């Protein structure tokens, strides 16, 4: 099928709340090799965010039950967490490898580079949420490095209020808080991203202001939550 048909299919699936369909469309659009338009890019992101999101959320629930059941009830919770975990790693590995094979090497401008480098940061972070063993330190460093290169590219080439730069600070700050356990570096990173944007609320445009202000709100709420 042709890219534009697949896109319209993805939008039907989205409207129907059938995100696995949605991801399968956008995955196959990506596999055609062409650079993604940015409506398309957003579609890929939404599909995959909702598909891992359901697992992340089941994983968390079954994880809590597993650790709060000291019998053979624990054996059953463990096996179910693991089965959930392995679906979740399959979802991240899929996005991760779409990002290595198509999306990052095709990115022509800073904006897209930051977008995908961020996504690569995120999907590594979802894998880190869930990793045990020697696995962990590698996954984490992957995530950190993807964020870091994205961060550097946005401080040099995007405005302080660009939604995609703001979003990257928000998620990079979350990585520092949640994964690395460095609340102090997470706060400083979020606080500067909020302050630099709030001093240029001029300069937002019509296509971006709802997103940029909503992210600024979350930077602040996180700030509030982490200073408690």
């Amino acid at each position: 099928m042709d890219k534009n048909e697949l896109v319209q299919k993805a939008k039907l699936a989205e409207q129907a709340e059938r995100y696995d369909d949605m991801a399968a469309c956008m995955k196959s659009v990506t596999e055609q090799g062409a650079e993604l338009s940015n409506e398309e890019r957003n579609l890929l992101s939404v599909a995959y965010k909702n598909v891992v999101g359901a697992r992340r959320s089941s994983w968390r629930v079954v994880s809590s039950i597993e650790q709060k059941t000291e019998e053979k009830k624990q054996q059953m919770a463990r096996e179910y967490r693991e089965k959930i975990e392995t679906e979740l790693r399959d979802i991240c590995n899929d996005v991760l490898s779409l990002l290595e094979k198509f999306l990052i090497p095709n990115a022509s401008q800073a904006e897209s580079k930051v977008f995908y480098l961020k996504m690569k940061g995120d999907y590594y972070r979802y894998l880190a949420e869930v990793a045990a063993g020697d696995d962990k330190k590698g996954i984490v460093d992957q995530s950190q490095q993807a964020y870091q290169e994205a961060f550097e590219i946005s401080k040099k080439e995007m405005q302080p209020t660009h939604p995609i730069r703001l979003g990257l600070a928000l998620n990079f700050s979350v990585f520092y808080y949640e994964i690395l356990n460095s609340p102090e570096k997470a706060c400083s990173l979020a606080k500067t991203a909020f302050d630099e944007a709030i001093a240029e609320l001029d300069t937002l445009s019509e296509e971006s202001y709802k997103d940029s202000t909503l992210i600024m709100q979350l930077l602040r709420d996180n700030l509030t939550l982490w200073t408690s």
Binding site: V46, K49, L170, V174, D211, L218, D221, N222
Partner: peptide
């Protein structure tokens, strides 16, 4: 639980 960037 921290909040990360939502969908647009």
């Amino acid at each position: 639980r921290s909040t990360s960037t939502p969908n647009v």
